[PDB]
Amino acid sequence: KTIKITQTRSAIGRLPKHKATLLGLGLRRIGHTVEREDTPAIRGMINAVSFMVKVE
Amino acid sequence: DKKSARIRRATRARRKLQELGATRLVVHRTPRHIYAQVIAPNGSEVLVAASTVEKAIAEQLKYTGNKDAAAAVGKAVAERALEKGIKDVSFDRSGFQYHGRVQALADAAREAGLQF
Amino acid sequence: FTINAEVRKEQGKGASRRLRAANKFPAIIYGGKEAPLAIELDHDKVMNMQAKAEFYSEVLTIVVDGKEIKVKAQDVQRHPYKPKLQHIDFVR
Amino acid sequence: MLQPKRTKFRKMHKGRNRGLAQGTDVSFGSFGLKAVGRGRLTARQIEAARRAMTRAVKRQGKIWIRVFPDKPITEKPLAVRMGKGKGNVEYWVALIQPGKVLYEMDGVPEELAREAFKLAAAKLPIKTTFVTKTVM
Amino acid sequence: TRNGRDSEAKRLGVKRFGGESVLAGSIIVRQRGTKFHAGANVGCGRDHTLFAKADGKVKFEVKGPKNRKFISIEA
RNA sequence: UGCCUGGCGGCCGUAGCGCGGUGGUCCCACCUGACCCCAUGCCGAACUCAGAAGUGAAACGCCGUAGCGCCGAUGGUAGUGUGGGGUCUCCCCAUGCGAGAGUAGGGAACUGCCAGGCAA
RNA sequence: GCUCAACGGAUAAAAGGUACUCCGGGGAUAACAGGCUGAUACCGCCCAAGAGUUCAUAUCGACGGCGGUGUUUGGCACCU
RNA sequence: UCCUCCUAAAGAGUAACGGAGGAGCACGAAGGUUGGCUAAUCCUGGUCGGACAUCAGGAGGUUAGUGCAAUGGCAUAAGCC
RNA sequence: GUGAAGAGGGAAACAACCCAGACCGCCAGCUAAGGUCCCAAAGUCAUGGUUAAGUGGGAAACGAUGUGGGAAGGCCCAGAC
Ligand SMILES: [K+]
Ligand SMILES: [Mg+2]
Ligand SMILES: [Mg+2]
Ligand SMILES: [Mg+2]
Ligand SMILES: [Mg+2]
Ligand SMILES: [Mg+2]
Ligand SMILES: [Mg+2]
Ligand SMILES: [Mg+2]
Ligand SMILES: [Mg+2]
Ligand SMILES: [Mg+2]
Ligand SMILES: [Mg+2]
Ligand SMILES: [Mg+2]
Ligand SMILES: [Mg+2]
Ligand SMILES: [Mg+2]
Ligand SMILES: [Mg+2]
Ligand SMILES: [Mg+2]
Ligand SMILES: [Mg+2]
Ligand SMILES: [Mg+2]
Ligand SMILES: [Mg+2]
Ligand SMILES: [Mg+2]
Ligand SMILES: [Mg+2]
Ligand SMILES: [Mg+2]
Ligand SMILES: [Mg+2]
Ligand SMILES: [Mg+2]
Ligand SMILES: [Mg+2]
Ligand SMILES: [Mg+2]
Ligand SMILES: [Mg+2]
Ligand SMILES: [Mg+2]
Ligand SMILES: [Mg+2]
Ligand SMILES: [Mg+2]
Ligand SMILES: [Mg+2]
Ligand SMILES: [Mg+2]
Ligand SMILES: [Mg+2]
Ligand SMILES: [Mg+2]
Ligand SMILES: [Mg+2]
Ligand SMILES: [Mg+2]
Ligand SMILES: [Mg+2]
Ligand SMILES: [Mg+2]
Ligand SMILES: [Mg+2]
Ligand SMILES: [Mg+2]
Ligand SMILES: [Mg+2]
Ligand SMILES: [Mg+2]
Ligand SMILES: [Mg+2]
Ligand SMILES: [Mg+2]
Ligand SMILES: [Mg+2]
Ligand SMILES: [Mg+2]
Ligand SMILES: [Mg+2]
Ligand SMILES: [Mg+2]
Ligand SMILES: [Mg+2]
Ligand SMILES: [Mg+2]
Ligand SMILES: [Mg+2]
Ligand SMILES: [Mg+2]
Ligand SMILES: [Mg+2]
Ligand SMILES: [Mg+2]
Ligand SMILES: [Mg+2]
Ligand SMILES: [Mg+2]
Ligand SMILES: [Mg+2]
Ligand SMILES: [Mg+2]
Ligand SMILES: [Mg+2]
Ligand SMILES: [Mg+2]
Ligand SMILES: [Mg+2]
Ligand SMILES: [Mg+2]
Ligand SMILES: [Mg+2]
Ligand SMILES: [Mg+2]
Ligand SMILES: [Mg+2]
Ligand SMILES: [Mg+2]
Ligand SMILES: [Mg+2]
Ligand SMILES: [Mg+2]
Ligand SMILES: [Mg+2]
Ligand SMILES: [Mg+2]
Ligand SMILES: [Mg+2]
Ligand SMILES: [Mg+2]
Ligand SMILES: [Mg+2]
Ligand SMILES: [Mg+2]
Ligand SMILES: [Mg+2]
Ligand SMILES: [Mg+2]
Ligand SMILES: [Mg+2]
Ligand SMILES: [Mg+2]
Ligand SMILES: [Mg+2]
Ligand SMILES: [Mg+2]
Ligand SMILES: [Mg+2]
Ligand SMILES: [Mg+2]
Ligand SMILES: [Mg+2]
Ligand SMILES: [Mg+2]
Ligand SMILES: [Mg+2]
Ligand SMILES: [Mg+2]
Ligand SMILES: [Mg+2]
Ligand SMILES: [Mg+2]
Ligand SMILES: [Mg+2]
Ligand SMILES: [Mg+2]
Ligand SMILES: [Mg+2]
Ligand SMILES: [Mg+2]
Ligand SMILES: [Mg+2]
Ligand SMILES: [Mg+2]
Ligand SMILES: [Mg+2]
Ligand SMILES: [Mg+2]
Ligand SMILES: [Mg+2]
Ligand SMILES: [Mg+2]
Ligand SMILES: [Mg+2]
Ligand SMILES: [Mg+2]
Ligand SMILES: [Mg+2]
Ligand SMILES: [Mg+2]
Ligand SMILES: [Mg+2]
Ligand SMILES: [Mg+2]
Ligand SMILES: [Mg+2]
Ligand SMILES: [Mg+2]
Ligand SMILES: [Mg+2]
Ligand SMILES: [Mg+2]
Ligand SMILES: [Mg+2]
Ligand SMILES: [Mg+2]
Ligand SMILES: [Mg+2]
Ligand SMILES: [Mg+2]
16 A cells, blocks of 8 residues: 655755655655555654645 | 672672683582582583582581581592592682681592692 | 532543532542542532541541542642642542 | 852852742741742841841841852953953852741740841842641 | 973773674784783783783673683684 | 581572571581690681680571562653654654663572481 | 873964054944843832831831833844 | 863854963883782771771761873773782 | 855845756746735735734843733632732
8 A cells, every 4th residue: 555745845945854855755846646655654754844845 | 698608709709710711629618508609601501519518528527517517528528539430629608708617628628639 | 528529530630620620529439348449529619628637537428429428538638829729538 | 258168169150049948937937038939138238128027027026047158249340351261259158949938036026026027138139928837 | 380291192092892703913002001811722921911822802890809801702 | 318517619688787586416617735846927716736625606508587688560751763843042743772770579599519427 | 101181182383563564255243333132231110127296108218119211331143 | 382161053063361280390110011909088886096097897989099280081990810 | 055156036225044056938827935005916804812112123130919821829708908
């Protein structure tokens, strides 16, 4: 089962960890609907940058 | 207390010997009787043990607590040790000054064949 | 000396402050071979209760889910400067 | 004027006066002056507020001082440039977090214990309140 | 001022941590006193430096009568 | 099989103290002698040797007792990563991590491997 | 075999004056004034131990507290 | 120039004309190693002998000691013969 | 983290704050932070409150029967203020 993630904020004034985490999720620009395989890890990544992403 | 002073006097040898990981021959002396036991490098399990408290050795001797009795144990332990397969060991004097009974025990252990 | 009290479900820093900023405050009941019981209760009652010296000595019967549990106040946390309670430890 | 009789070090860092106080309960005496506010009390302020209580309640009653300075405050002389060393210790302060009981009274009426603490509170910088020795 | 002097920093601390694979000779801890002690297959030089005496994984233990920290190696 | 006591480790204070009671057939300790082996920077108190008259007094074990020490939740509290907000030398929400202290209490440890004696 | 201690040591070997001065630069850095700050300064106010023939507040106020101004002595070195 | 502590935000490192102290040697035994030891401060009692020499005991448990500053260490002692 | 070396929108104007990273064109649409009576794009939107001070739209200790919202206490038709 896959989960659709969407970037909902800019990655400008953000920590290197958070800039990395979006590269790990595969989100490039704001409003980028990327779907990933649901695991304990990806939910951790989404948890790490929850403020700037939205799950479907 | 005397005992406690003898334990900490021995400890340095023991702790140095367990670090090397060698099979030690502990020798506990007493006013009446002299004990000896070969203990495995791990420290827990005993491989060979003999003393003048054992009737097999006590029946033979005149008195259990002297140089000639210590030699009889020192022979006995080393006589068993070779049957078990043991040969290279160390000698833990165990806080007793290497001089009399323990020296007799050690010399008897050497002369019996236990190469250490 | 009888107070109605609800059972807690969320418990931590976040819940307890939400609770404590809603005219209520957390307490706990424990004692005997039974398990402890986390107990949410109203502030404005228990604030008026403690003015009497009997409260910190006599036996109180706390009403939870119908069941009335007999206890004594073993420990209590005052708010640092404001005159108000933060938490009560009820021994059984 | 209260001050430590000898100390390990003459000068101390500035630090930060954060968190809540620890001497919150009215321990010894019946009544007490609790600090609502946050700040720092100089050695002079404490003595000034002590004199204002002591003289209000007369010879009768007993007073405790729960706060003690033990924190030296340095100050640089007038018309001196920055650097060239840490300044010289002028006065001593006690850091006061919210909740700290400053003073405690005993052996006086409740109505006349309050009137004394108002006069003390008037000397102090920190916003204060009256507290009674409750049970538990 | 009266003071304003200081020594160069000595880079002391646990170099290789627990569970880390090390080669024979690898320094595990640089420190002053024996804050950590030498256990199995670990040496203790003149500087009280704990170093690996055999190739293996580092293991920190808290064992003894006085409850001291020991560093051992297990292959 | 249990009851004992030694030696030797594991565990390091739930394992240590104080307190009270006890053990001596062996075992162990004091003990008995010092021509000797060897010993004191004087002294057989040590260390050592030879022994077995006494003893369990002290030691050591061992069982008891919470007077201490120690162990110690739950709930709360304090901190605090991340993101936001304030009245911004301080704090507060949201979300995660979450003590220290102190309670309720637990607590007179638990076991390995030989080795000897004792009711079976 | 070097307090080559200005201790990565310019030479084996070296101190001053310049208002008679000069050149290259700098608002990277001072003096003037501006700015930021307000310790100090001045101006208020809060508490009332004291004055009063007695009787805090006619009038002044100890000990302590809190502000305002930019306003002296300053601090900073942002403009030149 | 060098060493120690903090500042230093629990890896390392980390500045100021920040806060406190040291070093520019010593040692043929104060090194090696085998064998032994165990400390301050008391309280008692004791010829001069006092507030304090030496002895005897107890209570203490490293409160000492470590050639020299500080920090980390040291009973298996790295302390003392 | 940003500027430096980053334009654009907001913060009246405002390198460093908030939003967001400009390849070029378009008289298309959705949004962010900010906003939506007129200057000036968009609610004189709806609902339930609170402020009478132009508060909002600078400032503290202290000072006040200004004015809401609670929770207790007084103590009385034998009529309490
Ligand atoms: K750096
Ligand atoms: Mg982006
Ligand atoms: Mg940002
Ligand atoms: Mg892109
Ligand atoms: Mg693009
Ligand atoms: Mg030795
Ligand atoms: Mg027998
Ligand atoms: Mg600090
Ligand atoms: Mg504090
Ligand atoms: Mg406390
Ligand atoms: Mg100077
Ligand atoms: Mg420096
Ligand atoms: Mg250093
Ligand atoms: Mg440095
Ligand atoms: Mg340098
Ligand atoms: Mg070496
Ligand atoms: Mg025991
Ligand atoms: Mg006993
Ligand atoms: Mg007894
Ligand atoms: Mg008896
Ligand atoms: Mg008895
Ligand atoms: Mg017999
Ligand atoms: Mg004798
Ligand atoms: Mg003897
Ligand atoms: Mg006995
Ligand atoms: Mg007795
Ligand atoms: Mg038992
Ligand atoms: Mg019991
Ligand atoms: Mg009891
Ligand atoms: Mg009991
Ligand atoms: Mg649990
Ligand atoms: Mg943030
Ligand atoms: Mg935060
Ligand atoms: Mg938020
Ligand atoms: Mg807002
Ligand atoms: Mg603001
Ligand atoms: Mg907890
Ligand atoms: Mg705890
Ligand atoms: Mg605890
Ligand atoms: Mg208790
Ligand atoms: Mg009990
Ligand atoms: Mg037992
Ligand atoms: Mg059992
Ligand atoms: Mg078996
Ligand atoms: Mg020459
Ligand atoms: Mg020079
Ligand atoms: Mg130079
Ligand atoms: Mg240089
Ligand atoms: Mg250098
Ligand atoms: Mg040079
Ligand atoms: Mg030269
Ligand atoms: Mg020269
Ligand atoms: Mg000149
Ligand atoms: Mg001139
Ligand atoms: Mg000229
Ligand atoms: Mg010129
Ligand atoms: Mg010129
Ligand atoms: Mg300039
Ligand atoms: Mg310059
Ligand atoms: Mg001037
Ligand atoms: Mg100027
Ligand atoms: Mg201005
Ligand atoms: Mg000002
Ligand atoms: Mg004045
Ligand atoms: Mg003042
Ligand atoms: Mg002027
Ligand atoms: Mg000026
Ligand atoms: Mg300058
Ligand atoms: Mg500058
Ligand atoms: Mg200009
Ligand atoms: Mg540090
Ligand atoms: Mg560090
Ligand atoms: Mg760090
Ligand atoms: Mg730097
Ligand atoms: Mg110096
Ligand atoms: Mg030298
Ligand atoms: Mg010598
Ligand atoms: Mg040596
Ligand atoms: Mg004793
Ligand atoms: Mg010491
Ligand atoms: Mg020292
Ligand atoms: Mg040595
Ligand atoms: Mg030594
Ligand atoms: Mg920008
Ligand atoms: Mg540039
Ligand atoms: Mg921009
Ligand atoms: Mg802009
Ligand atoms: Mg503006
Ligand atoms: Mg505008
Ligand atoms: Mg604009
Ligand atoms: Mg810009
Ligand atoms: Mg923001
Ligand atoms: Mg681009
Ligand atoms: Mg693009
Ligand atoms: Mg739109
Ligand atoms: Mg939308
Ligand atoms: Mg917003
Ligand atoms: Mg919006
Ligand atoms: Mg319009
Ligand atoms: Mg419009
Ligand atoms: Mg209209
Ligand atoms: Mg309308
Ligand atoms: Mg409307
Ligand atoms: Mg409306
Ligand atoms: Mg209204
Ligand atoms: Mg109105
Ligand atoms: Mg206004
Ligand atoms: Mg105004
Ligand atoms: Mg009033
Ligand atoms: Mg009214
Ligand atoms: Mg109104
Ligand atoms: Mg309310």
